[PDB]
Design a protein around this ligand. Structure first.
Ligand SMILES: *O[C]1[C]([C]OP([O])(=O)OP([O])(=O)OP([O])(=O)O[C][C]2O[C](N3=[C]N([C])C4=C3N=C([N])[N]C4=O)[C]([O])[C]2[O])O[C](N2[C]=NC3=C2N=[C]N=C3[N])[C]1O[C]
Lengths: 51, 676, 466, 748
RNA sequence: AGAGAAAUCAAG
RNA sequence: UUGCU
RNA sequence: GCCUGUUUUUGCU
RNA sequence: GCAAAAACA
C-alpha cells in the first residue's frame, strides 16, 4: 500500500500510531523520515551485547 | 403501443428495447441559448420560497432555510444547516472504512496529484482569449501566465498549481504577453470575474428529451481546485455501499444485484429521479458537509480551506449569457440583451455583469456529480430509513423491507423529506414505487428477474470509423463482442449485427458492386483475399476476437506469397515520415534507428483537406518529447526522474551512449565534437 | 520527492496551501460564512409534516390532440414508394433509357411545390444522360431550391414591419392522428417477390456459429420478403447518394439518382434527388433538395405539399412526387445507416426463440408460438412471424419520424410501460403527492403522427387490471 | 552500423536545441507534463467522412517513393506532380494497397511470423480448445472480474515496470530493480521479443510485452462453476441462454504454492507464537530466484493456505467460506458469527470439547453449489426465509444440509450429543453428515409444512416437484442476488493463523486452520527452504541435506549455532533433518570428541569454509540416532545417507560435497567460488549525478559476476556505486532483534 | 417557398 | 463521373 | 459549436 | 499518456 519498499513492514506498522501525521506538514514524508530514524536506531543496535 | 406489450411468451420488460427511436436522427439546438441560460438562472430563486418571490430571494447569499420554509409540494431550493450537520455526522460515524480511505488519500494520493491531469479534459473556457480552447492549450497558457506573473516555477503537483492560483489573486495587476506581439492586462477584479465565469453553450445530438438543455464550462483557474474535491469524493464513494456513480458497467449491475434481497412480509422497490437537479443544490451545503468530514477526521485548516475554495467560487458564479434574447416586431427577428427591453427575466437584470449574469443559488453545472452524490447519501443515514439506497447523480433506486404497508409509506415519505432537507427534490412524476419488489429501473437499466439487455444502445456504435480498414474491422468486431459479453445482444442479434457491420464496412471501402477499386482489381487479376477487398468474410461469431490476417493465414485462405507482401515493414504505403528507434535484445548496441513502415499496407492514413502560435509551441514540445523518448528509453516504462535541465540531461545521456558504442576512440571524439 | 524530503529535514514546513487576505475577501463576497464555516446552530434533524403516497389504481390515459390530420412529413414516401424496371446496366444508362422514353404530364399541382420546377428534373436528367451529375443553374432552380430566398424574405419583412418589439412567443401547431398511419401499417407488410435483404453470410466454424447463422437466416427469411426491406434499401441508397455529394461547396445543381438492382440485374428506379447550391458551414444546417420519386397511390390529405405528375414509360403509367425539401447533413448520415433498424425486431425474435430453447433444453429454430396481444381492445393470439414483421414496420416508421417530440415521448413512456407490466403481475403501484406521470408524456404529444399512433395504441389497451 | 544511429541522435539533439531554444531549459522531470500536449491529432468525426474520404480522387496520403509506379496499367496511381518533397505529401488512390498486395516486394518469412506472433497465439488458442456441446438452461448471471487474456507468466503489478526494464534496457537499471523483477518472465519475454523487437518500435514492443505479462481484469457476467478463467472466449462459451461444456486443466503452479504454504502453516503451528514464525520464514524462503513475498503477491488464488500466507504478508485474499461442495458469503449481518465453546465432557475429569459457530442477531447469507444458488435470511438460529434458484427436479439435500451446518439451525448435532461419546471434531461432523443424509425430517420439523401447492420445494427435497404438501418459507429466487463488497476488505491474521475479516461489530472469521483438509502435494519447482528452521519439508534426502549444508557453509553464525546446538544436545531447529539423514549407528560420542579437539585447537575455525564443512559433517554424525546395543566405534571417513546411494565425505573429495582449492560445490552446485563472487551480497552505498571513481559496468548483470569491490550502474542520469557488504547480519534480522528486545523489555 | 420546432437554415 | 438489395 | 463524472472498444506515442 | 467512438447520469 503506502509502505515504501525499503521500509520494513513491522516498522511501518509500528509507526502508524506514534504521531498524528494528518496535521503535520508532509505527513507521509514525515512518517517515512521517522521510519528512517527508527531503522537507523535498529541498525545501530544489531546483535551487540556487553554483559 | 399494443404491439410492444406481449402477454404470453415474453414480458413487456424485454420489450423496453423497442421504446427507442435510435438509428433515427437526434435532435439538435439551432439558435440562441440565452433563454435557457436565464431559465436555469431564475429557477433556483423561484423555488427558495413556497410562493414564487424572485425579488425577495435575490439578496440572499447562503441558501439556508427553516424547516417550515421547505416546500413539500414542489421543488425546494435550499438546505437546513442543522440537518446537514447532523446527517454528515451520522454519515461519518457510519462507513468508517470510507473515512480511513479518505485520510489515506489526503496523506498519500493528494500530494502526488499532478496538474497535468487537468489536460485530460475537453473544450475549456479561456480567461485569456475569451473562447473555448482544447484543455492542453488552456492548461499551458494558464501555467505560463502563472509562471510569468509569480516569477517562480510551479511544481508538477496539483497543490503547487492551486497555491499559484491563490497567489496570483493577491497581485493588483497581472499581464499575459502571449507574443504569438500582443499584450493584455488584468486587474484583481477582472481576474476574479474571469475565474468565476462559466461559458455556456448548447448541447447538441442529445437524445431522450423534448427540450434542449444548456451546458457550461469554467476556466482552468478553478478546474484544478474542483479536481481535488472530485478525487476525494470519488475516494469516499468507492467505499460506501449506497453509492452507484463510481462503479459502472457490470460492476454496477453486481452492486445492484447485491441489494435485490426481498425477504420480509412487505418488500417494495422505488425507482426515481430528482427534479430540478444541479439547480436546487446550494454549494454552501457541500461546503458544510465537506467541512464536517474533514473536521471529524482531524484534518488541519489548510485542507479545509482548499476543499472550500471551489464551492465558494461557484457561489459567485457568472454564467455567460448567450448572444441575446430574440424579439419580433412584425416578421423581423432582432436579438437584444436582457436589459434592453422588458421580458420575463427582468428581475435578474440587477445580476448582469457585462455579458454574464451572477447566480448565488444553485450550482448550474455538473462539476460535482460525485459531491452531489455524497450530499444525497448523507441524508439517507438516519434511524427511520432501513432500506437499501443507491444514488448515482440524480437517479436513485431504493428497496424497502417492511412488515406493513403503512410502515413502507412512512419510510418513503421520510426519504422524500430527508432529501428535501438538503436541496434534492424527488420528481413526483418520475418516481415509481412497486409494493411487491422485483421490477425496477436504474440508469436506464430495467430488471424484472435479471437485468435485461438493451438493444439500440449499441447500434449508434455499429458504424465503421475513418482510420483504416483493419482498425475499423477490429473496432467493430470488438464492440459487437463486448455487447454480446455484456448481454445486450444475443447469438442471433450478434451475428446479424456482424453481418450488417460487414456489409457497411465493405461498402465504405468500395468493395461492393462495380466501383473503381473493383474494376482495378478485376482488370489486373487481383483476387481480393481480404474482407475490405470484397473477399468472403473470415470472421465468425466465435472468431470476433481473432485478427483477420492471422486467421486467414491459419485457415490457408491467405498464402505466404501475399503475406510477405501485405506485411512488409518497408512498404511505401504506410511508411512513416521520420526514422524511428528500435530495441535490440541481447545485442552489443541495444538502440538501432532506421526508417520504418506500419507492417500492414492496409493500415494507411486518409488525407485531410487543407491558439495558433501555441500549436507551434506544442509542436516544439512534440519534438522535445520525441528526442527524449529516443535518448531515454527507460522513461518509456517508468516516470521521468533524471536531474538537471533537459539540455544537460540529454547531453550527458548522449555522451554516455556514445561512450558505450564499442566504436574506436577517433569515432567517439569526432562524434562528440559536433554536439551542440 | 527530493524537495519534500529536504523541506521536512530542514524543518521550514510550509503549509502547502494558504489563502491570502484580499483573496479571502473576494471569496467571502457571495456567502454568509467564512472560508471554514462554523455555524452556531445545534446539529439536529427536524420533523416535517409530509404528504401521503397514493396508489395508482388505474393507468393514466394519454390525451389525444385535436386538429387537422398530420401530413406525411418525411424525406421519402415510405409504403407508397415504387420503382421502374430498367434494363441492366449502370445508373447513367438507366437514366438515359428512362429520359428518352418518358412523358411527363402534370395532374396535381401544389402551392408549396410549383409544377414549373419539373423542367429542373428533366434538365438534371439531361445532365446525367451524358455523364454530368453537375449542371449549371437554370431559372426555375431559383424557385426550386429557394436561391436568395432569405434576403427576399428579410426585405419583405422589413417593408411590412410595424408595431412594437415583443418577445418571440413561438407556436407549434397541434395536429391529430391521421388515417394514413393505419394504412401505412397495413401496407409496408405485404409480401414481395425478392428477398430485399441480401447480406453476406458469416463464416461457420463451430456449432454455436451454426445455430447463430440459422437464427439469422430464419429472421431474414421471415422479414426479408416485405415492403419494409425494399423501402429501407431505397432510403439507405438515397441517403448515401445524397450524403456523398455534400462534403463540398457547390453553386450548381447535383443529381443523385435512386437506383437499386435485383438479382436478375435489372435496374430499379426509385427516383432521383437533386441537391441545389449548398455551402455548408456546419453539420446541422439545412441544404436544399428536390425529391422526385415514384408513387403507388396519391392522397391529397397525405401529400399536400407534393406535386403529383403522371409519367408514361413504355405503355406503363407511374406517379411522380417531386417535393421541395431542406435536409441536414447529420440526418442524411444517420439515414445512410438505416439498415441497423432490423436489430430490434431480430432481438425480440431471437429472445423468444432462445427462451423457448432454454425452457425445453433443446433448440427448435422453427417455433412460431402464439403471442397474446391486445389487438382491437381485446386480447387475441397472433403468430410470432407477423408480430416481428410489424414490429419491424413500426420500428422503421419511428426511425424516419424521430424528432424531439418522439424522443421525449419514448423516453417518458418507459415508466408507464414498466408500471403496466408491474400491474399485470398483481403488483400495486404507489405514487408521490403531486405525481402525474402522464403529463411528461402528454407534453411531447403535439403533431407527430406516429407519436399519436402510439398514444392511441396505449389508450386502446385496458387501463385497469384485476 | 551503430555509427549512423549516433549521427541521427546527435543531429536530432542539435535540431531540438536550435529549433526549440525553450522547452529544453525546463527540468527533465517536466517531461511528465508536456508529454501530454498532443493536439492537432484531433478530428471532428471520422465515421461521418469515411465514405466521402475513400471516394476522393487521391484519398491516401503517403511519403514519396519510387516503388509505386507513377502510372500503372491504364490507371494513374500516385499524384506526385504538385508539391513533391513535403514530407507525407504524395497522394495515391485507394487501389494502391490493392496494387501492393500483388506485384510488390516481399519480406523474409521470419519477419511475417514475428509480426503475427501475438495474434497467432490467439488464433491457435481458439483452434485448440475442445468445443463441447451446447447446453441450454436459462442461466442466472454471476458478475465477477475475470482476466481479459492469458499471460505467459503471473507477475504482480508492482513488479511490472521493473521486469520490462530488465528486458529492454538492462543498461539503465539498478540492482534493486533487478531484484524486484521476475527473472523467469524476463527470460520468457526476451526469448519472445528477440524477433518481435526487430519489426516493432520501442513503445510498441513495450506494449506487447506488458500485454503479455499483465492481467487487466474486467467485469463480466459468467456462469457458476463454468468460468473459462479468461474473457477471451466468453462470447462463444456462454450467452445467457447456453454454455459450451469445455474441459481444461489448471495449467498453473498455484496448487504447488498452496502445498508449500500448507506445509509451512502446519509446521508453524507447532511452535510458540506461530504468526511471527511464519512471517519470519516467509521472508527467508525463495522460489527459483524470487522471494516468497513477491511470489505470494503474484498468485492471488482462491485457496485457503495461499490466502493465509498472503494475509501474513499484508496482502488480501479472495477465499470464501466453503462447506464441502457449497460456498457461502454473508451479504450483511448485525453481528459476526459468534463461536460457542460447547463442552461434551466424556467424564467429570476427562472432557472433550467441540466448539462450533452460529449467528447472533439477523443475518443474510448467499450460497451456491453446482448449478443451485440463492440466499437465506435467518435470525439467531431460526431460519426466516430461503430463496433458491435451481434446475427442475434437482436434488437439494446437500445444499440445505450445508446451510444447516453453516448456521447450526438444526440441533440433532448442535447444543446436544448424538449418542455415544464423540471421539473428536472429525468423527462428530462425519456422523452429523451421515445421519442427516438419510434423515432430512429435521428440516421439515424445523420449518413445518405448508398446504399451498405453489411452493416449489418438495418434502423430499426436489425443486419444482409435485407433491401433497410443500416446505414453507422456501421460494424461487425473485431477482438475481450476488455477493458484492464495496469497501475494500482488510484482513487480520490472529494467533493460530486465523484469517479474520474486519466486521463492524467485531471480527468475522474467514479462514481457520485445523479443519482445512488437503493431501500432501508436490512442492513448487525451484523452492529453496535453506533459509531457516524448515528443512524437513523436503521429502528427498538429497535436497534435504543440500539445503542444510548450504545454510551451514554460507553463514558462519549459522554454522556456529548448529555446532553448539548439535554438540551439547541443545534444541536445534533442524534435529529431524539430522536424524533422517544419517542411519542408525554408533559414531555419536566419537564425533563429539572430534568436535572437542577441533574447537579447542582452533577456536577461530568458523571463518574457513573447509573448516565449516568438516565441523558440520562431524556435528551431523554426532547427533544421529545412536544404536542402543552396539558399542561406540570410530567415526568413518565417509558414510551413506538413508534410503539413498549418496555418499557424504569428511574431506569432501567426492560425493555430495566437493571442495577443490578453486571452489566448493555442494550437491552439484558451486556454493562457493574463491576469488570472485563472495558469499555475502552488496549494498548500494551512494547515489551521484556524476561518474564516481569506480568501474562502470554495463548492466546489473555482467555485474555480481566479476566480484569487484566497487562498481557503478547508471539509471536516469544517476550513478549507483555498489561496493560490498561487510556486516555479518541483515537489516531484517536487525529490525526483528530490536523489536523483540523492545517487546521483551516492555513485558519484563 | 420549404425544412423545422421554443429559433435557426434557406451565402455571398 | 455514376453500381450496398 | 461539441461541459463534468463513470464505464466500455480500438489504435498511436 | 494521447486520439477517436459509444452508452449512461
Ligand atoms: O494513466 C496511465 C497509467 C495507468 O496505467 P498502469 O496500469 O498504472 O501501468 P503504468 O504505465 O506502469 O503506470 P505508471 O507507472 O503511472 O506510468 C509508467 C510510465 O511509463 C510511461 N509509459 C507507460 N506505458 C505502459 C507506456 C508509456 N509510454 C509510451 N510511449 N507507451 C507506453 O505504452 C507512462 O507515460 C508513464 O510515464 O500508466 C500510463 N500509461 C498506461 N498505459 C500507457 C501509459 N502511458 C503512455 N502510454 C501507455 N500506452 C498512464 O499515465 C502516465
Amino acid at each position: 500500500t503506502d509502505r515504501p519498499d525499503h521500509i520494513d513492514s513491522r516498522v511501518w506498522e509500528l509507526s502508524e500510531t506514534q504521531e498524528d501525521w494528518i496535521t503535520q506538514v508532509h505527513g507521509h514524508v514525515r512518517r517515512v523520515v521517522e521510519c528512517w530514524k527508527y531503522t537507523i536506531c535498529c541498525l545501530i543496535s544489531n546483535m551487540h551485547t556487553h554483559r | 403501443m399494443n404491439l410492444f406489450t406481449p402477454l404470453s411468451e415474453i414480458n413487456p420488460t424485454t420489450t423496453q428495447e423497442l421504446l427507442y427511436a435510435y438509428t433515427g436522427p437526434a435532435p439538435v439546438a439551432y439558435g440562441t441559448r440565452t433563454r435557457a441560460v436565464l431559465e436555469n438562472i431564475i429557477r433556483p430563486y423561484q423555488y427558495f420560497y413556497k410562493e414564487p418571490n424572485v425579488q425577495r430571494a435575490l439578496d440572499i447569499k447562503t441558501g439556508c432555510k427553516e424547516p417550515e420554509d421547505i416546500n413539500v409540494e414542489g421543488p425546494s431550493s435550499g438546505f437546513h444547516t442543522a440537518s446537514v450537520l447532523k446527517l454528515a455526522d451520522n454519515f461519518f460515524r457510519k462507513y468508517r472504512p470510507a473515512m480511513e480511505k479518505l485520510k489515506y488519500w489526503i496523506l498519500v494520493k493528494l500530494p502526488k496529484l499532478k496538474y497535468a491531469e487537468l489536460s485530460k479534459g475537453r473544450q475549456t473556457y479561456s480567461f485569456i482569449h475569451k473562447r473555448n480552447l482544447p484543455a492542453p492549450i488552456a492548461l499551458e497558457e494558464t501555467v505560463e501566465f502563472l509562471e510569468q506573473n509569480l516569477r517562480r516555477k510551479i511544481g508538477p503537483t496539483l497543490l503547487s498549481y492551486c497555491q499559484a492560483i491563490a497567489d496570483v489573486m493577491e497581485l493588483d495587476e497581472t499581464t499575459y504577453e502571449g507574443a504569438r506581439t500582443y499584450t493584455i492586462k488584468f486587474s484583481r477584479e477582472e481576474l476574479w470575474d474571469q475565474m468565476r465565469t462559466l461559458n455556456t453553450m448548447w448541447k447538441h445530438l442529445e437524445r431522450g428529451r423534448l427540450n434542449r438543455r444548456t451546458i457550461a464550462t469554467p476556466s482552468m483557474l478553478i478546474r484544478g481546485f474542483v479536481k481535488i474535491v472530485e478525487d476525494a469524493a470519488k475516494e469516499i464513494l468507492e467505499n460506501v455501499p449506497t453509492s452507484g456513480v463510481p462503479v459502472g458497467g457490470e460492476e454496477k449491475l453486481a452492486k445492484l444485484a447485491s441489494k435485490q434481497t426481498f425477504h420480509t412480509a412487505v418488500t417494495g422497490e422505488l425507482s426515481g429521479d430528482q427534479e430540478k437537479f444541479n439547480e436546487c443544490l446550494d454549494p454552501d451545503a457541500m461546503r458544510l458537509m465537506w467541512t464536517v468530514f474533514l473536521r471529524k477526521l482531524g484534518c488541519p485548516d489548510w485542507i479545509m480551506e482548499l476543499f472550500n475554495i471551489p464551492f465558494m467560487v461557484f457561489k459567485s458564479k457568472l454564467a455567460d449569457m448567450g448572444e441575446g434574447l430574440v424579439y419580433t416586431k412584425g416578421k423581423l427577428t432582432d436579438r437584444k440583451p436582457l436589459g434592453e427591453m422588458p421580458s420575463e427575466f427582468d428581475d435578474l437584470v440587477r445580476n448582469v455583469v457585462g455579458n454574464s449574469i451572477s447566480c448565488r443559488l444553485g450550482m448550474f453545472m455538473g462539476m460535482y456529480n460525485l459531491t452531489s452524490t455524497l450530499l444525497a447519501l448523507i441524508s439517507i443515514e438516519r434511524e427511520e430509513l432501513t432500506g437499501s439506497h443507491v444514488e448515482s447523480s440524480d437517479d436513485f433506486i431504493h428497496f424497502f423491507n417492511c412488515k406493513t404497508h403503512e410502515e413502507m409509506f412512512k419510510q418513503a415519505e421520510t426519504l422524500r423529506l430527508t432529501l428535501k432537507l438538503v436541496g434534492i427534490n424527488m420528481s413526483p412524476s418520475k418516481c415509481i414505487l412497486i409494493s411487491p419488489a422485483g421490477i425496477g429501473e436504474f440508469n436506464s437499466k430495467f430488471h424484472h428477474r435479471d437485468f435485461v439487455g438493451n438493444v439500440a444502445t449499441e447500434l449508434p456504435a455499429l458504424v465503421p470509423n475513418g482510420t483504416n480498414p483493419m482498425t475499423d474491422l477490429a473496432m467493430g468486431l470488438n464492440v459487437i463482442k463486448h455487447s454480446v459479453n455484456t448481454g445486450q445482444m444475443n447469438l442471433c442479434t450478434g451475428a446479424l449485427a456482424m453481418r450488417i457491420f460487414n456489409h457497411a464496412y465493405k461498402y465504405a471501402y468500395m468493395a461492393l458492386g462495380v466501383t473503381r477499386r473493383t474494376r482495378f482489381m478485376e482488370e489486373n487479376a487481383i483476387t481480393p483475399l481480404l474482407t475490405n477487398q470484397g473477399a468472403s468474410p473470415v470472421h465468425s461469431f466465435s472468431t470476433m476476437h481473432l485478427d483477420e490476417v492471422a486467421l486467414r493465414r491459419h485457415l490457408g485462405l491467405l498464402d505466404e506469397e501475399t503475406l510477405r507482401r501485405i506485411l512488409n515493414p518497408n512498404n511505401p504505403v504506410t511508411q512513416k515520415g521520420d526514422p524511428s528507434m528500435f530495441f535490440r535484445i541481447e545485442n552489443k548496441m541495444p538502440q538501432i534507428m532506421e526508417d520504418y513502415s506500419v507492417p500492414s499496407c492496409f493500415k494507411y492514413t486518409l488525407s485531410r483537406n487543407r491558439h495558433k502560435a501555441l500549436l507551434n509551441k506544442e509542436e516544439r514540445y512534440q519534438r522535445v518529447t520525441s528526442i527524449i523518448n529516443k535518448l531515454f528509453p527507460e522513461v518509456l516504462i517508468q516516470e521521468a526522474s533524471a536531474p538537471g535541465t533537459v539540455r544537460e540531461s540529454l547531453k550527458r545521456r548522449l555522451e554516455l551512449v556514445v561512450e558505450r558504442s564499442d566504436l574506436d576512440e577517433e569515432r567517439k571524439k569526432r562524434i562528440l565534437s559536433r554536439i551542440f | 520527492l527530493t524537495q519534500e524530503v529536504v523541506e521536512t529535514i530542514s524543518g521550514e514546513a510550509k503549509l502547502q496551501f494558504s489563502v491570502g487576505t484580499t483573496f479571502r475577501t473576494l471569496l467571502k463576497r457571495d456567502t454568509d460564512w467564512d472560508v471554514i464555516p462554523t455555524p452556531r446552530v445545534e446539529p439536529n434533524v427536524p420533523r416535517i409534516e409530509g404528504r401521503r403516497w397514493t396508489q395508482m389504481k388505474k393507468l393514466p390515459l394519454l390525451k389525444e390532440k385535436e386538429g387537422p390530420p398530420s401530413p406525411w412529413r418525411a424525406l421519402l414516401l415510405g409504403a407508397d414508394s415504387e420503382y421502374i424496371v430498367c434494363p441492366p446496366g449502370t445508373d447513367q444508362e438507366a437514366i438515359s433509357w428512362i429520359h428518352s422514353q418518358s412523358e411527363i404530364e402534370c395532374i396535381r399541382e401544389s402551392k408549396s411545390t410549383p409544377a414549373s420546377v419539373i423542367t429542373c428534373l428533366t434538365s438534371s436528367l439531361q445532365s446525367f444522360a451524358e455523364g454530368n451529375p453537375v449542371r449549371s443553374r437554370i431559372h426555375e432552380d431559383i424557385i426550386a431550391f429557394g436561391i436568395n430566398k432569405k434576403q427576399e424574405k428579410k426585405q419583405s419583412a422589413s417593408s411590412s414591419a410595424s408595431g412594437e418589439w415583443k418577445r418571440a412567443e413561438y407556436q407549434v401547431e397541434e395536429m391529430s392522428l391521421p388515417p394514413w398511419v393505419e394504412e401505412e401499417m397495413v401496407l409496408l407488410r405485404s409480401d414481395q417477390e425478392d428477398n430485399w435483404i441480401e447480406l453476406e453470410k458469416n463464416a461457420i466454424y463451430t456449432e454455436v456459429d451454426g445455430v447463430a447463422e440459422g437464427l439469422v437466416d430464419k429472421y431474414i427469411e421471415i422479414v426479408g420478403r416485405t415492403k419494409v426491406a425494399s423501402v429501407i434499401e431505397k432510403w439507405q441508397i438515397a441517403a448515401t447518394r445524397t450524403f456523398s455529394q455534400l462534403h463540398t461547396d457547390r453553386s450548381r445543381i447535383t443529381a443523385c439518382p435512386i437506383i437499386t438492382r435485383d438479382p436478375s440485374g435489372n435496374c430499379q428506379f426509385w427516383g432521383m434527388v437533386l441537391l441545389g447550391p449548398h455551402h455548408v458551414k456546419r453539420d446541422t444546417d439545412n441544404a436544399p433538395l428536390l425529391i422526385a420519386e415514384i408513387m403507388g397511390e396519391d392522397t391529397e390529405e397525405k401529400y399536400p405539399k407534393h406535386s403529383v405528375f403522371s409519367l408514361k414509360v413504355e405503355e406503363k403509367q407511374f406517379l411522380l412526387s417531386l417535393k421541395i425539401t431542406s435536409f441536414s447533413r447529420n440526418k442524411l448520415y444517420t439515414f445512410s445507416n438505416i439498415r441497423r433498424v432490423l436489430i430490434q425486431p431480430a432481438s425480440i425474435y431471437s429472445q423468444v426463440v432462445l427462451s423457448r430453447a432454454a425452457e425445453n433444453n433443446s433448440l427448435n429454430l422453427e417455433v412460431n408460438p402464439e403471442i397474446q396481444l391486445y389487438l382491437e381492445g381485446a386480447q387475441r393470439g397472433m403468430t410470432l412471424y407477423q408480430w416481428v414483421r410489424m414490429i419491424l414496420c413500426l420500428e422503421f416508421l419511428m426511425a424516419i419520424y424521430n424528432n424531439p417530440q418522439m424522443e421525449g415521448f419514448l423516453a417518458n413512456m418507459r415508466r408507464l410501460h414498466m408500471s403496466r407490466h408491474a400491474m399485470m403481475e398483481r403488483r400495486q403501484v404507489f405514487l408521490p403527492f403531486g405525481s402525474r406521470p402522464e403529463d411528461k408524456v402528454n407534453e411531447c404529444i403535439i403533431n407527430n403522427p406516429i407519436v399519436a399512433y402510439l398514444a392511441k395504441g396505449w389508450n386502446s389497451m385496458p387501463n385497469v387490471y384485476y | 552500423e551503430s555509427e549512423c544511429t549516433l549521427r541521427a541522435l546527435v543531429e536530432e539533439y542539435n535540431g531540438a536545441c536550435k529549433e526549440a531554444p525553450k522547452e529544453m531549459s525546463k527540468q527533465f522531470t517536466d517531461y511528465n507534463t508536456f508529454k501530454r500536449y498532443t493536439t492537432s491529432k484531433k478530428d471532428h468525426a471520422p465515421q461521418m467522412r469515411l465514405v466521402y474520404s475513400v471516394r476522393k480522387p487521391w484519398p491516401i496520403s503517403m511519403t514519396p517513393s519510387k516503388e509505386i509506379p507513377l502510372v500503372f496499367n491504364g490507371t494513374k496511381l500516385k499524384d506526385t506532380i504538385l508539391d513533391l518533397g513535403e514530407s507525407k505529401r504524395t497522394r495515391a488512390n485507394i487501389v494502391v494497397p490493392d496494387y501492393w498486395s500483388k506485384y510488390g516486394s516481399q519480406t523474409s518469412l521470419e519477419v511475417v511470423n514475428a509480426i503475427l506472433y501475438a495474434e497467432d497465439l490467439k488464433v491457435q488458442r481458439f483452434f485448440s480448445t475442445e468445443w463441447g456441446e451446447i447446453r441450454y438452461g436459462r442461466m442466472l448471471p454471476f458478475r465477477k472480474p475475470v482476466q481479459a487474456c492469458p499471460t505467459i507468466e503471473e507477475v504482480n503489478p508492482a513488479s511490472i515496470p521493473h521486469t520490462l526494464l530488465q528486458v529492454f534496457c538492462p543498461q539503465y537499471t539498478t540492482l534493486d530493480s533487478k531484484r524486484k523483477a521476475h527473472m523467469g518472465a524476463v527470460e520468457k519475454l526476451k526469448r519472445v521479443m528477440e524477433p518481435i523487437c526487430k519489426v516493432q518500435t520501442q513503445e510498441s514492443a513495450v506494449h506487447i510485452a506488458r500485454s503479455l505479462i499483465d492481467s487487466n481484469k474486467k467485469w463480466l457476467p459468467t456462469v457458476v462453476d463454468h468460468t473459462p478463467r479468461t474473457a477471451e472466449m466468453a462470447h462463444f462459451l456462454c450467452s445467457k441462454y447456453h454454455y459450451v461444456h469445455t474441459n481444461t486443466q489448471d495449467l498453473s503452479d498455484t496448487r504447488s504454492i498452496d502445498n508449500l504454504c500448507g506445509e509451512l502453516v502446519k509446521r508453524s503451528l507447532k511452535c510458540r507464537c506461530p504468526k511471527e514464525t511464519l512471517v519470519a520464514n516467509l521472508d527467508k524462503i525463495t522460489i527459483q530466484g524470487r522471494p516468497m513475498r513477491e511470489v505470494l503477491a503474484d498468485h492471488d488464488g482462491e485457496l485457503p493456505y495461499l490466502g493465509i500466507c498472503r494475509v501474513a504478508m499484508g496482502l488480501s485474499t479472495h477465499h470464501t467460506m466453503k462447506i464441502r461442495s457449497t460456498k457461502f458469503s454473508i451479504l450483511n449481518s448485525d453481528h459476526p458469527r459468534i463461536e460457542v465453546k460447547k463442552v461434551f465432557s466424556l467424564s467429570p475429569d476427562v472432557q472433550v470439547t467441540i466448539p462450533y459457530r452460529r449467528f447472533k442477531g439477523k443475518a443474510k447469507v448467499y450460497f451456491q453449489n453446482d448449478q443451485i444458488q440463492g440466499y437465506f435470511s435467518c435470525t439467531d438460529r431460526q431460519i426466516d426465509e430461503i430463496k433458491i434458484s435451481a434446475p427442475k427436479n434437482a436434488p437439494l439435500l446437500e445444499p440445505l444440509l450445508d446451510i444447516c451446518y453453516y448456521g447450526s439451525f438444526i440441533e440433532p448435532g448442535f447444543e446436544q450429543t448424538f449418542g455415544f461419546y464423540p471421539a473428536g471434531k472429525r468423527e462428530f461432523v462425519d456422523s452429523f453428515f451421515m445421519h442427516h443424509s438419510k434423515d432430512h425430517k429435521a428440516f421439515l420439523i424445523h420449518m413445518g409444512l405448508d398446504k399451498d401447492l405453489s411452493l416449489p420445494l418438495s418434502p423430499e427435497l426436489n425443486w419444482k416437484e409435485p407433491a401433497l404438501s410443500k416446505v414453507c418459507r422456501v421460494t424461487e429466487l425473485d431477482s438475481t442476488v450476488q455477493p458484492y463488497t464495496s469497501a475494500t476488505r482488510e484482513f487480520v491474521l490472529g494467533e493460530t493463523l486465523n484469517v479474520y475479516t474486519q466486521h463492524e461489530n467485531g471480527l468475522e472469521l474467514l479462514i481457520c486452520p485445523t479443519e482445512i483438509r488437503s493431501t500432501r502435494g508436490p512442492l513448487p519447482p525451484g523452492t529453496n527452504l535453506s533459509g531457516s528452521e524448515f528443512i524437513d519439508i523436503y521429502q528427498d534426502p538429497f535436497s534435504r541435506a543440500k539445503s542444510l549444508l548450504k545454510s551451514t557453509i554460507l553463514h558462519a553464525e549459522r554454522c556456529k549455532e548448529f555446532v553448539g546446538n548439535m554438540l551439547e544436545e541443545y534444541q536445534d531447529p533442524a534435529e529431524t533433518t539430522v536424524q533422517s539423514l544419517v542411519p542408525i549407528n554408533t559414531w555419536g560420542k566419537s564425533a563429539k570428541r572430534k568436535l572437542q579437539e577441533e574447537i579447542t585447537s582452533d577456536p577461530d575455525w568458523h571463518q574457513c569454509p573447509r573448516k565449516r564443512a568438516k565441523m558440520s559433517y562431524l556435528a551431523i554424525i554426532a547427533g544421529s540416532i545412536q544404536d542402543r546395543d552396539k558399542k561406540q566405534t570410530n567415526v568413518p571417513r565417509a558414510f551413506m545417507l538413508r534410503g539413498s546411494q549418496i555418499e557424504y565425505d569428511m574431506k569432501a573429495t567426492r560425493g555430495l560435497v566437493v571442495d577443490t582449492t578453486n571452489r566448493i560445490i555442494v550437491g552439484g552446485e558451486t556454493v562457493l567460488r574463491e576469488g570472485k563472487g563472495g558469499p555475502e551480497g552488496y549494498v548500494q552505498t551512494g547515489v551521484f549525478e556524476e561518474q564516481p571513481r569506480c568501474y562502470l559496468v554495463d548492466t546489473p548483470d555482467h555485474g555480481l559476476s566479476m566480484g569487484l569491490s566497487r562498481f557503478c550502474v547508471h539509471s536516469q542520469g544517476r550513478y549507483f556505486q555498489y561496493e560490498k557488504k561487510i556486516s555479518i547480519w541483515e537489516e531484517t534480522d536487525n529490525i526483528k532483534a530490536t523489536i523483540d528486545s523492545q517487546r521483551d523489555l516492555k513485558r519484563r
